Structure formats: C-alpha cells, structure tokens
Amino acid sequence: NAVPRPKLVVGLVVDQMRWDYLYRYYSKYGEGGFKRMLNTGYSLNNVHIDYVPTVSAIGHTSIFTGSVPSIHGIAGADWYDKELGKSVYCTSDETVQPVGTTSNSVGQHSPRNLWSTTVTDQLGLATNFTSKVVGVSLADAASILPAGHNPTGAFWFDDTTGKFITSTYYTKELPKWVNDFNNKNVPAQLVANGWNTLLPINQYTESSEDNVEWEGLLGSKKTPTFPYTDLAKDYEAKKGLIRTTPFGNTLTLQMADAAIDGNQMGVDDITDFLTVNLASTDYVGHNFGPNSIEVEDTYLRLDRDLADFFNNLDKKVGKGNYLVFLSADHGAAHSVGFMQAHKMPTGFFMKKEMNAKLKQKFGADNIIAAAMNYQVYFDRKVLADSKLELDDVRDYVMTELKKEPSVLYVLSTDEIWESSIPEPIKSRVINGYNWKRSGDIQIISKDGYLSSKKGTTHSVWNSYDSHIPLLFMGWGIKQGESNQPYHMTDIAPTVSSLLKIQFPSGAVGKPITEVIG
Ligand SMILES: [Cl-]
Ligand SMILES: [Zn+2]
Ligand SMILES: [Zn+2]
Ligand SMILES: [Zn+2]
Ligand SMILES: [Zn+2]
C-alpha cells in the first residue's frame, strides 16, 4: 500500500572522470564494476555540464541540487566575497568545531554556503527525516555538499591523523561505527606494499610511456615512474599522500561499507541515501594527467573496488533493492606537454601585472581585488575611495585581456546575454554567474589551454572538461544506452522522479525519462 521505492540509493561521483575512461580501458575492466553498470543498467553517453567554470565543489553541488551556481551559491571551491573582502572556501564554517580531530582547518566545515536544497534534503523532507543520509569522501566539500543541510552524517578525511572526522554541524561526537573503522587503520594497511601496477606495466598500451616531461612526482620519488616503493614511509609522514594513490578510493569505499552497516542503511522500507565521492581519480589526474599509466591503473583498481562494492550491496541490501547512479563532477584536459608531444593546439594561460598597468592608467593601486576561476573581481573599496567607475576599469581590463593569446572570449558579467558568444557557451556562462560571489569579468580560453605545468586541470566549457559519464543501475532502471543530450542538472530530477519526491528547490533540470522503467 506505500509509495514503491528502493531501500537504498547510492550516489557515486568519480572525481575528474572523463566519460571516455569508460571506453579507452574497456578491454581491461573486469565484469563486475563499470562493465556491470553498462551491461545491466543505463548509460547516458551525451551528458554535459551546463555551467562554467567546471571546477571543484560546483559539480558535486550541481549533481545533487539539479541547480547551477547562479542559484545555488557554490561558485567555486573558493571565491572572492567582496563584502567579506577576502577569499572564501566553499565549506569553511567558523561556527562549528572539529569532531574526531583537533585541527580547525580540517574540521571546521559545513554546508551553510549552499543556498538550495539537495535531493538528499528532499528525501529527508519526504520521509519526515527517518531516512539515513550519509556522505563520504576524502575531501570535505565532496562529502558535505551532496549530503545536504540535514543528513545523518557527513564524513571526510583528516590528513593530519589518517582518520575520518566530521564537525559539530552534524554531531557532538563521532559515532561508534566511525571510531571502530578508524582504529583499524585501513590506510596504513592499504599502502603497506607501495603502489605497483595491478597489471604488468607493459600492458598499459592505452597510456603513454612511464617517464614523460609532463607528469609530476608522488612522494620522495623524484621521477614520475613506477614503482612507488617509498609509499609506506612517506604515507606515515604525510597522511594526505594516500589521496594521490588508488588506495584513496579503496579507503573511501570501505568507509562507505562501514557507513552502510553502521547506520543499517537499506534494511527496512524507508529509503536511505548514501553519497560517495571517489576523490583519488582527481588527485592522481591532477598530478599525472589522463594519458598516464598512473591514471589508467587508478581506473583499473577503481573498477575492481566497485565490483566488490556492488557485491557487498547485493549481500547487505539485496540485488534489485538498491538504486545506483555514477557520474563525475567534471572531466579534464590532456596535459599541455602531452598535447605538444602530439601537435594538438594548447598552451598555458595576472593580478600584479594587470594592477601595475591599471595604476599607470587610473592612478590607484590594488584596483583588482582577485583573479580566480577565470574571473576578475575589482576592489569595490578602491573604486569608491579613488573615485573610479567600475565600467571604465572593466573596459580597460577587457581590451587588455582580448589581446591575450589563450583568450577566446572576454566579457563583462553584467552583459552576458547580449554578447556575441554562441551557445552552449553563453547559457553556461549565465548559469555559472553568481551575482554575489562571482567576478565582474568572465574569460573563456581557446581550446586546449590550461592554467601547475605538470599533470592537468579542469575548468572550461569544452567537452573534454564538461562531458561526464552518467550511469544508472538497479531498482527502477532498464538496461540500455542513449546519445540524446542531457545536462548535469538532469541527474537530481531523475532521482527525484524515481523516488516520487519533490524536486530540489533550485533545480533547473528535467528527469531523464528514458532511464525510468
Ligand atoms: Cl576538485
Ligand atoms: Zn572534482
Ligand atoms: Zn608515469
Ligand atoms: Zn532505511
Ligand atoms: Zn580537481
């Protein structure tokens, strides 16, 4: 007689996972992980992120809010808040205390900068908060933001201790199940044998050579190569080191398994919601880039871990009784050096320099307050004190930025809709522009250009950063594939529709009807 629902839904985000990681390594995946999602669920192969910039924090926020930065407030991992006169980190919250650790900078985090509800909020609202809602990630923002404003818990990793901790936003004390998991020192176990390729290194024929100009270093190791035999001694000295190993993902998923058991997630009929961000694909990607043996081996290892993870769910909840979606919060470019190695257009993409010229032109210093997320913020204080017009300073800076080489478009964020920019870029710039927290000028780079000179990063509209995988499996989901276009903001309404719960409050997207069986 009740609304049909799965006992559990799991939201998996593989950080920095380009859609084509699914297929470039398809031949080397086992049958139980990625290939299981493809072979028993539904894959949307033409999903794009419908805002810029495609940086950290926003993708996680947008996945779970169905919303965009203009509305939901998460304008970047960091942003310049003019009324605060300083940069702000997305989850930093001075009014809470660390729980499980003594580090303020590690534990003083909360979801308070988030203006819109999440699908996890709406599930709590729909069941009168009898739902178990738990977020897990190594990184704070990727746990906190998906889990929303009133989950059962949200846990992230403490680099100073190797523990999973939280903040007093959630509870006064770590739950018993967390203390137990931490006392097993799973991280020490996982890296004890160093990091070697899971397969024999000569079979990583989808990666470049092992030693290349454009890859960075991991530990005392001073060459970008396997094997990483120093991993155990280096891990005890910097516990955050495990982030940049596949072991970071294995750790995350065992913690998630513990969350399931610790909270009795998915045993009764009240739907529960687990969110898991796999952060190590990003760390390793940032350091080595998408064509590296390191990244490939991370995805082969992640694949095995997901096979195990899905088998644990089969056992603990029952096959068919849970709903999983897997996506990414962004892709990533190829390394600049790798692109140069193969003749692809690329390059590297300012405050001190541009301020100097602005003083020699307008007669005031520190006119630019900040330059981040491909945006320029002008210092509203200096403008008013020096009697200067925002538009005149903005016009000089734009004319100056145009002649840059890496620059495709530059526009004032007051005048996006009338600029001569094609879709889908124009609407993505709108969707990403937060009036309170975003800069006064928007910059769009030429294809293939990057902002660190090793590894890679993500931020642009281009398909390599914006094209994300999206796979559903389990309860309510038919098997199949589609190349119809969809947006990152369509995931949360899909889950909402599947659960027969109200959409998140800032949602702009629509349910992907073809996955619903
Ligand atoms: Cl990130
Ligand atoms: Zn990310
Ligand atoms: Zn390498
Ligand atoms: Zn339940
Ligand atoms: Zn990243």
From Swiss-Prot:
Binding, substrate: A77, A139, D140, A141
Enzyme class: hydrolase
Gene name of the encoded protein: pafA
Stored InterPro entries: Alkaline_phosphatase_core_sf (IPR017850), Alkaline_phosphatase_prok (IPR026263), Phosphodiest/P_Trfase (IPR002591)
Intracellular or extracellular location(s): Periplasm
Major localisation: periplasm
Induction cue: Expression is not repressed by inorganic phosphate.
Cofactor(s) the record lists: Zn(2+)
Name of the featured protein: Alkaline phosphatase PafA
Organism the protein comes from: Elizabethkingia meningoseptica (Chryseobacterium meningosepticum)
